[PDB]
Amino acid sequence: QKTIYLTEDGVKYRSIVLKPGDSLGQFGQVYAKNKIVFTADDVEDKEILYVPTTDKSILEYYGLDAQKYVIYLQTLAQKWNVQYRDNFLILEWRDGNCWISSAIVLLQAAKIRFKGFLTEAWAKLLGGDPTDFVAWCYASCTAKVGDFSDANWLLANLAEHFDADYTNAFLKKRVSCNCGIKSYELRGLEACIQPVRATNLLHFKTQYSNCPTCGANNTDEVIEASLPYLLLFATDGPATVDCDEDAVGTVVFVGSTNSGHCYTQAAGQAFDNLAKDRKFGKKSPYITAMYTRFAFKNETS
Ligand SMILES: [Zn+2]
């Protein structure tokens, strides 16, 4: 006979006694962590089991809707290994998980801090248990283990929970064409995450397009920035350029839009969880660059 602990959130529990005859159907659907459970025979005395929730406070705590939360719980069964590369934790490779591994290295390079559910999940990962954090990553992208997914989608998802000073995050841009010289400002999270043609500061600071109102070439320039962090995302696939030395890290993409592989560069090193011996390359096909405590002002002419 067994006493098991049921939880909707991983914080509040209720105990339940399973007599030798009983089954798990009585609880509705249940999920276990780092093991697979089909029947009450698979559950040990004092084991914790997780159940789905529709409670708005719990879902808002997690930052997931009810359907993503179900995927979260499903991915709790997985068992991952963390490995150490110098001072960085990497997620041991399997099943196309390099987009997640890459995000994990990059956020270490930035010394990111989280708020909410992800604070404890990240702390647990850094302590050597990646289960909760990795399950959240899959969930946020509605992804199954085995899926490859957009590392920049994942980072944008995580960024919503950064414990960053978004209040005073500020970006001012100047647009020039035959319509005139105009300016616009971005604040908070939308200011910190920036789509670019290629991920370095040169391409961030000046963008070239054609104006849809007049006929001419237009120039969109950064003239002022004060940001807790800056994420540059490639808009049209990987673009091969020199990274900036100022970046805390970058993400490299190799392969095709179908069979693609990600790895992170930081502290002058390549962290490829699939290829141990990959070398740092300053010029690489980048999809991501990250900067911390970024500030800039352009007063010319
Ligand atoms: Zn114009």
By C-alpha distance, which of 109, 111, 90 is closest to 101? 90
Residue numbers after which the chain breaks, C to N beyond 2.5 angstroms: none
Identify the helix (H) or strand (E) that includes residue 58: helix 56-62
The catalytically annotated residue of 137, 161, 262, 272 is: 272
Q: How far apart are CA 244 and CA 140, in angstroms?
A: 30
Ligand 1 midpoint to CA 209 (Å): 10
Report angle CA 166, 161, 121 to the nearest 5 degrees.
145
Cross-strand partners of 284: 241
Q: Are 221 and 261 in contact (CB under 8 A)?
A: no
Ligand 1 centroid – CA 184 distance (Å): 15
Report the distance separating Cα 10 and Cα 64, nearest Å. Answer: 15
d(CA 6, CA 40): 13
Elucidation technique: X-ray
DSSP class of 275: -
CB-based neighbours (< 5 A) of ligand 1, an ion? 177, 179, 211, 213-214
Please give the annotated binding residues, written as ranges: 177, 179, 211, 214
Tell me if 95 sits within 8 A of 78, measured CB to CB: no
- Please tell me whether residue 18 adopts helix, strand or coil conformation: strand
Residue burial 200-226, b: 16+ Cβ < 10 Å; e: rest: bbebbbebeeebeeeeeebebbbebbb
Is 214 within 8 Å of 194 (Cβ atoms)? no
Residue 168 token pair? 């005073």
The amino acid present at 198, given as its one-letter code, is A
> If we measure between CA atoms, which residue out of 56, 79, 177, 166 comes closest to residue 131?
79
Q: Which of 141, 192, 261, 262 is catalytic?
A: 261
Question: 203 catalytic, yes or no?
Answer: no
- Annotation marks residue 42 as catalytic: no
Catalytic pick from 41, 98, 150, 243?
98
Given the structure tokens 């930052």, which residue do they identify? 63
Q: Is 137 helix (H, G, I), strand (E, B) or coil?
A: helix
User: What are the residues facing 297 on neighbouring strands?
Assistant: 224
User: Beta-carbon neighbour count of residue 139 at 10 Å?
Assistant: 24
Dihedral pair phi/psi, residue 210, rounded to 5°: -125, 135
Q: How many Å lie between the centroid of ligand 1 and the Cα of residue 204?
A: 20
Q: Report CA(212)–ligand 1 centroid distance (Å).
A: 7
Tokens of 226: 């004060």
Q: How far apart are CA 265 and CA 66, in angstroms?
A: 35
- Report which of 164, 170, 167 is spatially closest to residue 111, judged by C-alpha positions: 164
List, as one string, the DSSP characters of 193-260.
Answer: EEEESSSSHHHHHEEEEE-SSSSSEEEEEEEEEEEEEEEEEESSS-EEEEPPTT-SEEEEEEE-SSSE
Q: Are 227 and 295 in contact (CB under 8 A)?
A: yes
Rounded to whole angstroms, the Cα distance separating 168 from 279 reads 38
Q: Computed from CA positions of residues 138, 143, 147, 148, in that sequence, does the dihedral angle turn out positive or negative?
A: negative
Rg of the Cα atoms in the chain: 22
Helix (H) or strand (E) run with residue 80 in it: none
The binding site for Zn(2+) comprises 177, 179, 211, 214
Separation of CA 175 and ligand 1 centre (Å): 9
- CA distance to 17, 209, 246, 247, 296, per residue, from 289 (Å): 52, 22, 10, 7, 17
Rounded-to-integer distance, Cα 170 and Cα 189, Å: 9
Give the C-alpha distances (Å, rounded to integers) separating 144 from 68, 70, 89: 11, 12, 22
Distance CA 199, CA 195 (A): 8
Please tell me what resolution, in angstroms, this structure has.
Answer: 2.2
Report the C-alpha gap between 168 and 202 in whole angstroms. Answer: 24
Q: For this structure, is 243 an active site residue?
A: no
CA angle at residue 40 from 36 to 43, to 5 degrees? 55
| 49 neighbors 67 (Cβ within 8 angstroms) | no
Dist. CA 181–CA 175, nearest whole Å: 6
Burial of residue 51 (CB within 10 Å: 0-12, 13-18, 19+) is middle
φ, ψ of residue 241 in degrees (nearest 5): -150, 165
CA of 206 to the centre of ligand 1 (A): 16
